[PDB]
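Re-run requested by the PI after the first attempt was lost when the workstation crashed. Everything re-entered from the original request form. Ligand of interest: 2-oxoglutaric acid.
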Amino acid sequence: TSNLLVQQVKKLYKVGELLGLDSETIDVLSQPERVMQVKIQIRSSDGKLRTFIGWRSQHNSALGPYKGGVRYGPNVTQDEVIALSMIMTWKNSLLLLPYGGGKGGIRVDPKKLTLKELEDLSRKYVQLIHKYLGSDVDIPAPDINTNPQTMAWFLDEYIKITGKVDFAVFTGKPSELGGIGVRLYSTGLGVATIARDAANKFIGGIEGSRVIIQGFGNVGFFTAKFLSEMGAKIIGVSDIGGGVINENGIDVNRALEVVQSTGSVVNYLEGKKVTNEELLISDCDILIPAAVENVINKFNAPKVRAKLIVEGANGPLTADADEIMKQRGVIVIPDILANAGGVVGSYVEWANNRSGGIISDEEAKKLIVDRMINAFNTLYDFHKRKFADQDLRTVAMALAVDRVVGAMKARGLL
Amino acid sequence: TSNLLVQQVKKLYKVGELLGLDSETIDVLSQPERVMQVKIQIRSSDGKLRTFIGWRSQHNSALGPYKGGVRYGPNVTQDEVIALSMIMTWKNSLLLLPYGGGKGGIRVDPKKLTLKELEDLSRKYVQLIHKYLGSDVDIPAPDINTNPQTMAWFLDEYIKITGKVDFAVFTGKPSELGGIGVRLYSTGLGVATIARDAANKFIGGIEGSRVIIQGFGNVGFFTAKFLSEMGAKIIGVSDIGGGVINENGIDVNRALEVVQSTGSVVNYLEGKKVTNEELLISDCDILIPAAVENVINKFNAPKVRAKLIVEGANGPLTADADEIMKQRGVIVIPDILANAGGVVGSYVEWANNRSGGIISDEEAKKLIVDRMINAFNTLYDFHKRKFADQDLRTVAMALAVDRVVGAMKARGLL
Amino acid sequence: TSNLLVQQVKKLYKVGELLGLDSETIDVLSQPERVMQVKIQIRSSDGKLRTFIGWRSQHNSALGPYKGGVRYGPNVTQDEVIALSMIMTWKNSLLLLPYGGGKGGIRVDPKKLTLKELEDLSRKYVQLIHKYLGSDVDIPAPDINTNPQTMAWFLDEYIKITGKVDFAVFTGKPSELGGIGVRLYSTGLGVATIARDAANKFIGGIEGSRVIIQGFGNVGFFTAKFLSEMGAKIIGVSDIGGGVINENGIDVNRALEVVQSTGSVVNYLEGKKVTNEELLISDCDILIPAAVENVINKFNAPKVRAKLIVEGANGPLTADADEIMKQRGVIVIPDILANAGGVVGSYVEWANNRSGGIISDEEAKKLIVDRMINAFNTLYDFHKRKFADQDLRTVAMALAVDRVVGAMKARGLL
Amino acid sequence: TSNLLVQQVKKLYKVGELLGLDSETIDVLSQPERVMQVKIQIRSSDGKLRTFIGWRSQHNSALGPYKGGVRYGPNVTQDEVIALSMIMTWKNSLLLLPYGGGKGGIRVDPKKLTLKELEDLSRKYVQLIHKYLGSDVDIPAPDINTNPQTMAWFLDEYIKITGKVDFAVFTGKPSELGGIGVRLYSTGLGVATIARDAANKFIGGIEGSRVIIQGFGNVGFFTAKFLSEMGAKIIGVSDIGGGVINENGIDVNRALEVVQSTGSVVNYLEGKKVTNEELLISDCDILIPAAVENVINKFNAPKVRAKLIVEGANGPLTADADEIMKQRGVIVIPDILANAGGVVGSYVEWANNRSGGIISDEEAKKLIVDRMINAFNTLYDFHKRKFADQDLRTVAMALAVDRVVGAMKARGLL
Ligand SMILES: NC(=O)c1ccc[n+]([C@@H]2O[C@H](COP(=O)([O-])OP(=O)(O)OC[C@H]3O[C@@H](n4cnc5c(N)ncnc54)[C@H](O)[C@@H]3O)[C@@H](O)[C@H]2O)c1
Ligand SMILES: NC(=O)c1ccc[n+]([C@@H]2O[C@H](COP(=O)([O-])OP(=O)(O)OC[C@H]3O[C@@H](n4cnc5c(N)ncnc54)[C@H](O)[C@@H]3O)[C@@H](O)[C@H]2O)c1
Ligand SMILES: NC(=O)c1ccc[n+]([C@@H]2O[C@H](COP(=O)([O-])OP(=O)(O)OC[C@H]3O[C@@H](n4cnc5c(N)ncnc54)[C@H](O)[C@@H]3O)[C@@H](O)[C@H]2O)c1
Ligand SMILES: NC(=O)c1ccc[n+]([C@@H]2O[C@H](COP(=O)([O-])OP(=O)(O)OC[C@H]3O[C@@H](n4cnc5c(N)ncnc54)[C@H](O)[C@@H]3O)[C@@H](O)[C@H]2O)c1
Ligand SMILES: O=C(O)CCC(=O)C(=O)O
Ligand SMILES: O=C(O)CCC(=O)C(=O)O
Ligand SMILES: O=C(O)CCC(=O)C(=O)O
Ligand SMILES: O=C(O)CCC(=O)C(=O)O
């Protein structure tokens, strides 16, 4: 139902071969433990009854309860949600979080629903799967087209159903409902932090580096903002409405005001308007896919001009694109490290909730950044000492998949 | 992963149109409420690890908890299980049972596993979905390649997990584990009873009728036994191994002894060995598909030679076949009526379990036969007055769908 | 700590060998699945704190939830409670009830506690084991020195803890708290029914038959009353205070008056006062142990003068006694049949609770009496064809054990 | 069935009398609240069915949920398991942990089972008691012949049954499954820390002190390793295969190599081979029982040559031995203090799980070591002022019991 699953299975096959895993073990890791599909009907403002389908994929729980966000979008499919859940397994393993991989999606265009409709949609999604949710079973969060407001609805419905004011069942919550202020921008803070560290290690430094970012929402906006503060030059931004290239630099806050008033960054007046396709293959130092998956494939990988790719989106490169970047000498900082700001921020939110709320937002910001940087340093050091002939995704996946396999063996599952 | 779902959805649109239901209502009905996919891995003693995928489709619960069996089979798919779960919703509604429709399947060749491997499989299937099973949630049962032994494993695992000796969570159980003796043969008793009644109504009676049955398992054997006892001549039986025709009559018990000692009824000595395709188009009075779906289609339907077809299997004739039978004046008694002796018997088992186990076996036999004759008579009489331009299948589905819709309306769901 | 467990295990290995069971299979059956020991402390009316030990033995659950009574007594031990739970398994199997074998007891002299102290004891007993009780887990009942009042306390504590008004968690309840009138006297009705039927089969009938009953409580009294009404002559009754013999017959209702006003039937004026030992070896036609276990043994079995022993008590004869009675031509009707009116009455009470209370007292009486006579008649006819070289106890045990083994095999447990 | 329970109850009445407790109060403390016995049957690799008995003793829960390990061994009995659970109560009280005393064991020779057989055993053990386990009910852990691998199986079974990924239900877990690195060696670190501190207080310090350790497993090895690093001379080690003495010192890492390659430290080439009996009475400065209970008794206590005994094992000295060591001027550091590094490490693991995993390995090490030294220093200073006429064990028990009694009084239980 989606090519992302084909890509994510192929990336797993490649690391499994490198680890010397048996074919059958790879098969177990390639398939999710449990997937739920659910029907949601809502009565719209116009009086019309509409039916939507959603999923929750629970890929792997060797290392703890399932963890991952929920996306709303008109092209969401079962296999997309499954694939996204597999990326969560690896990310959570890499960052040594006590979490397996989970993900959800509803096949809907949220831009065409009222707030009341979206609320009703959100509540019913939780209602239909809740026997397989819990703060120690499967903890959702935001993703494309969901946000702290979605999480407040999710939480309120869970409280309604279970009677338990369990803050820890959802992350990305508003800070007045048990969330943490840092989680709002923790993905982009992590992508910026990692991009800067990566640029210092690999391309001569971040200062004056020309950066193109695809997508301008929760990840893309904050990534732009923080990279701008760090002295990079943001020369390209885009969203679903298209992109803008300006070699003089984009005013990031102004661009957000353009989205707020017009609905797309493409309406930014000073710059060359471009297709998303053109934006990805335009000249830059660093390219940061921050929107959707499979945006760089066997067709455009040969035309990417960036020296350094940092993955803010989940699964923006196909398995072919991986091989092409390796052959071309383009350094790719993988999603499972680069974007882990999100889930590491959720971890702190979740642990704070379990602890009864005693972590400050300033401690939380430090905890997130430190884990991210420490993870990068571990990855770099394993790369240099054990897998110097492999790309960084391969090394990160080797660490991630090795840990999952060990835990499943200990538990008698393999 | 199957056309059986395409067929069921298409039938529902036609029936909804006939009932004057709007597109939006039909959309709700055509989508399952919840479907779970689960991964099962097993290590043989040979040492090899194998992975199997299974499903539980919970189609509709307007009228009660989900109810339906679980098939094992190497060609089982997600769409096949969803489709069979829709057939269960309608047959359950048609027979005025307090149940909605569900079904499960695992994609495995059970003939290639050891008994211990099958047990491990069956236990793990139940474990992986159990939070959405229960005696007032979803009550499984047998189907193809599963049986009382399978239900003993299901039950024992469920006891392990829940701590509760809730006999009612599964039907088709062994008598010594909360089952009822009549359930073993209730489907085939129902098929024979219905075939006799229809034969009396339409082709001059059951005595001396030449009957051909495809499949010789739980449905097919007992159908054959009861029709033998009722005066009919069984001239053809079959199974996955092929069939056997003898115009002088098959000895039904000897034939089972052939299955038992050789693995297939095709080894019966006294008759012509034939393929299944050939059995289905051989001369007879009554033809009873009792194996698998979609065995009679636009290609062999013109060649079938029977006066009366009684559907023991779920979904044995395609819509093209129904059309051709109508034109040819071949009577078809639909599965949702004819084979409902299984799920009615399961109702009696489940009710007996809930009431603490009091209902005697004889009264059980009576309750099943009465309900099924009454349903046929009701449907027969109804058809004279409304939907006279439609086949029996269409009328039966119309009543089944109408009842479901009425319950959803009452519950504020539509 | 009780010779009763040695008798039970020893009797079990003999039956296993006759059934041709592996030694390893018998090892499984000879050990309970779960046994709980609990501590109960009570602040007495004097002001003294006292500690009591109690147990719950859950022996086998192959055929259903554990079922059996709780006894209070100063000589109660862990192994007595285990042994009595094994007897429950075999009797529940024999009578084809959907129940396994359980038993409880507390090591206490209840005659030296106040009512409020006995309440506190009873409540604490249920509290400390409740996570392994339930109407589909383990359903307790009365036994020695417990009664419907005890059951009412047990129930009220279970409702307090769980918040569910689940009447089916205890049987022997008062009829205003979900009990049934017939359960008060169903044990004695069963014993009397069975004694008359055996008397008709083997000694020319009940009318004028001289009966001696040991024990005059729930089992003893009702046995006496019903045998009197059936036309037997009750020539001897006893309780823990001693016995009374009157060859002209005892007035049973008057004897109960004597017990209520003096505390022992030994104070019955018109008769010869005897020790319990003397009672058991006194001349009579029918002897009915209806007090405690192991009362007839290698020392007094040679001196018993009855034609027919009917076991009201659990385990009144030792294995040596069985051998002597066989050699002497004394017919013994084993406890697992003769006394099953209690647990069969419990079954009706439990099913009635589960059903919502449908079944009337008169239907209930009939169901119990019929199951008993049917069971005796089945056992009798069976015994002519199979195990004709063994006594009635042995053939009953053979059937009982065989059914359990079959259910365990079905469940993969053996 | 173990002399250990007699020692414990006897030691308890002495402490009670010193505390001025009523005999009736001591009766309550001397009896466990709940004890479960379970049956476990396993189909072995040969094809033979074997049955094993196991127990869970939940002794006291006044101060919190029950806490303590599970031991596998062919001499394990119900009363040994009860006695060890009492030791847990007193040590958890002494260390001011929010836990009561529990213990488990299974009567089995684990050295004669395959890994798969041990897995099956472990899983079934947890399954049969799970309704009285939970992270706030009863938290098990390792002991003799159990280890983090055992804990992983226990956990995976608990997740299977409950569907909750509750890491805090077991401690001693692998660090990838919610364990902590320091827990592997926290018992030995505690013993070594305490031995050094006592050596400094009482014998002029640890450097060059001659140490003899009985047992070379989780406690024994790490004790040896850490004392070596602290500058002690390890002159004697043993295991169930016998012992080795070398007055020049044993190479501790080499000895573990010998164990791994030969199965016993007795195969250590450079040293005099001795019986365990001989080891215990060999000349040394510090003697550390770190294997089993009751190894020093009235027969060998007169012949022990150490200045200082530090109890790594539970219950290694009998009451007679305590009296002799007191008369001889041999200082004994009791198990409830010396060995509490295990359960204090378990506490940190459990709190860390509840907190969401905040606490680092280095903070964890510090917390354990500090609580131990603080506890020893508190006990030392206390002992100068109160109970100065009693040994260290007696004063520790006095505090431990007094805290429990106070908590029970507060709860109305006493
Ligand atoms: N939110 C999180 O914490 C988080 C964490 C890790 C990774 N991610 C990944 O980051 C990516 C973006 O998530 P988000 O939270 O920023 O979502 P968002 O809904 O806040 O923003 C999505 C942005 O992408 C744009 N976009 C959508 N479809 C596009 C298309 N086809 N081409 C170009 N741009 C398009 C939108 O217009 C918008 O700017 C996704 O892959 C998501 O899985 C998100
Ligand atoms: N078991 C019930 O109570 C019940 C109730 C209603 C409907 N049904 C339906 O009846 C049919 C038979 O089920 P069953 O319970 O008797 O199954 P079963 O496993 O007991 O028997 C199946 C029989 O069909 C044969 N068969 C299998 N694949 C075949 C193929 N490709 N071609 C020909 N024969 C084949 C087998 O060899 C065997 O003889 C199925 O459609 C099932 O869903 C069963
Ligand atoms: N109550 C039931 O439903 C039921 C059912 C089946 C079997 N049983 C068995 O029947 C027997 C009696 O049970 P009950 O319910 O009548 O008990 P009960 O407490 O109602 O009466 C016990 C009677 O036995 C007497 N007794 C006690 N100890 C004695 C001794 N050592 N010697 C002589 N007499 C003694 C008492 O004085 C009293 O008369 C027990 O073995 C019990 O397990 C009871
Ligand atoms: N593991 C813990 O966290 C912990 C904590 C506190 C106390 N303890 C106690 O420490 C002792 C040892 O536990 P462990 O975890 O090290 O066990 P283990 O299974 O890791 O090692 C046991 C060691 O003792 C040896 N041994 C066994 N029986 C023996 C015998 N009869 N004579 C001599 N040596 C024998 C074995 O060969 C092995 O070297 C036990 O008393 C245990 O209850 C353990
Ligand atoms: O914060 C989370 O747990 C979910 C974020 C996410 O889904 C992601 O990392 O892509
Ligand atoms: O008896 C049942 O519940 C299952 C019956 C069924 O699945 C069927 O009718 O095909
Ligand atoms: O009625 C019951 O369940 C208990 C009866 C009993 O314990 C017994 O038969 O001895
Ligand atoms: O760490 C635990 O909980 C168990 C330790 C233990 O059993 C012991 O102290 O002997």
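Saved to the shared folder this time. The interface with chain C takes residues 22, 24-25, 27-28, 31-39, 41, 48-51, 53, 128, 131-132, 413-414 of chain D (CB under 8 Å).
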